[PDB]
């Protein structure tokens, strides 16, 4: 994935931002694959 | 006759020689990205 | 009172007010009360969620690979698969324990925690 | 019923029509040498 | 036998027509089902993106 | 157009188009239900139902069967009434108002009656 | 695939659905992995496995 930057109480991250980012990116890709599959099913119908 | 057939099958080639014995435009390619609320570094 | 939303990938499961949200993030247990600070956390692989409401019974949810996001007004729980208390079966959950597959054992543990058998 | 005979994910009305038509078709059947008095036919059709 | 063959083909084409019309209506309903599923998946995707 | 004029042709063709569309949507309505159709299709269906009801008429041969006598509708009045119906100027009226009547006056009277 | 060939990259193929399987089997292009039987009503389980 690429990176896009936008100019514009800070959030609390547990345990730290890096671990959550690592554990969430694969989840994001799984979500995108699921959305692609749903769109494919609708288009097929 | 069966023995002769089985023997002859050893020396027979199939058509493939197998044994008988037994550009998308990059712009159209959409890119997944991560939205980030930061100034362009 | 704070708005708890159990939202799954395949569908938004549950939404409503509650008085207290207990769960277990990676580091350890956590309890969320109305004006808790903004927070983003990852639930433990075999996590459970207890939503205590006003004038209603506790809502026990077995969560698979979820996340937690406390916002200025609402608490959002993300879940690959969240199963409500009435929907668990003791047999299958208890059987899934000690299985060779780690995800299956984690899901069974989450069901057991939701039931209360621990 | 003959309109819907080609079809279950239908409207409740369509499903009811299909089931009712199946029952009516089964009702109109009759064995040989078995004529019914008009009142019996009225009751069966009822 | 030309007429008999044509009549058989007419019956066959009628059966195919009925089946295709039924399948078209079923697919019409399935499109709504699939769109409903996409809508149901929308909020989780948006919030996880956030 | 060469015989009945341009306006008669235009109104008749509009009526035919609306009725054809409604006939096409009828199977979807019957099987998958009206709710499946879009709002545009729903309003077109309502319009077509009203038009086809208004195509009916209280005939003079029907008096022997029903108390009301028959009605005659001048061609111009029929053309203008169906033009307005296609435009969608009587959808707010109920469907039953369009059964077995003559011109626009009967339509209005049956509108107050219901 | 042609675009990747332009970039000097050999595509590595994964497939969902039987029809693509038949297509690539006819073309003899290898399929590293394949999941089938849910294209009608995919669930998050299948998407999770694929991802």
UniProtKB/Swiss-Prot annotation, chain C:
It is found in: Cell membrane. It comes from the Bacteria. GO terms for cellular component: plasma membrane; proton-transporting ATP synthase complex. Keywords: ATP synthesis, Cell membrane, CF(1), Hydrogen ion transport, Ion transport, Membrane, Transport. One of its GO terms (molecular function) is proton-transporting ATP synthase activity, rotational mechanism. InterPro entries: ATP_synth_F1_dsu/esu, ATP_synth_F1_dsu/esu_N, ATPsynth_dsu/esu_N. Gene3D superfamilies: F0F1 ATP synthase delta/epsilon subunit, N-terminal. The keyword Lipid biosynthesis does not apply. Its main location: membrane. The keyword Chloroplast does not apply. It is a peripheral membrane protein. F-type ATPases have 2 components, CF(1) - the catalytic core - and CF(0) - the membrane proton channel. CF(1) has five subunits: alpha(3), beta(3), gamma(1), delta(1), epsilon(1). CF(0) has three main subunits: a, b and c. Belongs to the ATPase epsilon chain family. Produces ATP from ADP in the presence of a proton gradient across the membrane. This is ATP synthase epsilon chain.
Curated annotation (Swiss-Prot), chain D:
It is found in: Cell membrane. Belongs to the ATPase alpha/beta chains family. F-type ATPases have 2 components, CF(1) - the catalytic core - and CF(0) - the membrane proton channel. CF(1) has five subunits: alpha(3), beta(3), gamma(1), delta(1), epsilon(1). CF(0) has three main subunits: a(1), b(2) and c(9-12). The alpha and beta chains form an alternating ring which encloses part of the gamma chain. CF(1) is attached to CF(0) by a central stalk formed by the gamma and epsilon chains, while a peripheral stalk is formed by the delta and b chains. Produces ATP from ADP in the presence of a proton gradient across the membrane. The alpha chain is a regulatory subunit. This is ATP synthase subunit alpha. It comes from Mycolicibacterium smegmatis (strain ATCC 700084 / mc(2)155) (Mycobacterium smegmatis). The lineage of its organism: Bacteria, Bacillati, Actinomycetota, Actinomycetes, Mycobacteriales.
Curated annotation (Swiss-Prot), chain E:
Transmembrane segments: none annotated. It is found in: Cell membrane. F-type ATPases have 2 components, CF(1) - the catalytic core - and CF(0) - the membrane proton channel. CF(1) has five subunits: alpha(3), beta(3), gamma(1), delta(1), epsilon(1). CF(0) has three main subunits: a, b and c. Produces ATP from ADP in the presence of a proton gradient across the membrane. The gamma chain is believed to be important in regulating ATPase activity and the flow of protons through the CF(0) complex. Belongs to the ATPase gamma chain family. This is ATP synthase gamma chain. It comes from Mycolicibacterium smegmatis (strain ATCC 700084 / mc(2)155). The chain holds residues 3 to 52 of 307 of the full protein.
Curated annotation (Swiss-Prot), chain F:
It comes from the Bacteria. It is found in: Cell membrane. Produces ATP from ADP in the presence of a proton gradient across the membrane. The catalytic sites are hosted primarily by the beta subunits. F-type ATPases have 2 components, CF(1) - the catalytic core - and CF(0) - the membrane proton channel. CF(1) has five subunits: alpha(3), beta(3), gamma(1), delta(1), epsilon(1). CF(0) has three main subunits: a(1), b(2) and c(9-12). The alpha and beta chains form an alternating ring which encloses part of the gamma chain. CF(1) is attached to CF(0) by a central stalk formed by the gamma and epsilon chains, while a peripheral stalk is formed by the delta and b chains. Belongs to the ATPase alpha/beta chains family. This is ATP synthase subunit beta. The gene is atpD. The chain holds residues 358 to 471 of 475 of the full protein.
